[PDB]
């Protein structure tokens, strides 16, 4: 196994990266990268919601890290932690129980414009991994998603979790 257990390392300069979303409301997300934990139940940082690392693209650094609770948190915090973002930040998000509540058209359209497809049909109890990036223009291709739905959801109640994993190409110090 190579940085966070994928089967291949990521050369080139890439940074390797895993997400794990979570499982029904009792097993957390993980955010693993160049293998570290951004986040996970060890280091004690993710909670039911969206759970989203912001990562310099360039050097890999973490930024910062934080849970938003999609049930009772107000919108506009998770707001306030995603708009403002330099170019270039990767978005790293795993959801947990619930990704969609409190989601609201100005949070679609944010999550749409770092690449995201699935932002805008994102319902109540849908899995989600995504990584995304400020100033991207087709859409990522790091991004998994699976409906709540009774025939398919693997749990009474909840989808299956979702793995996804990969290699990001690092920026440049150009500019
Ligand atoms: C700039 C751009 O392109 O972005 C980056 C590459 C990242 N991702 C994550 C989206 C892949």
Redesign the pocket.
Known sequence: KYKCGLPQPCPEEHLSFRIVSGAANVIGPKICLEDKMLMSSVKDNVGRGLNIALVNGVSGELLEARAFDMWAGDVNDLLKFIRPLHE?T?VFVASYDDPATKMNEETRKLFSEL?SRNAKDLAFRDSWVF???K???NK???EQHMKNSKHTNKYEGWPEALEMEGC??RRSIAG
Do not use: D, T
Request: net charge neutral.
């Open positions: 270039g990767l690449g990584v995304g990036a100033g991207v223009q990522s291709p790091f990001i190409p």
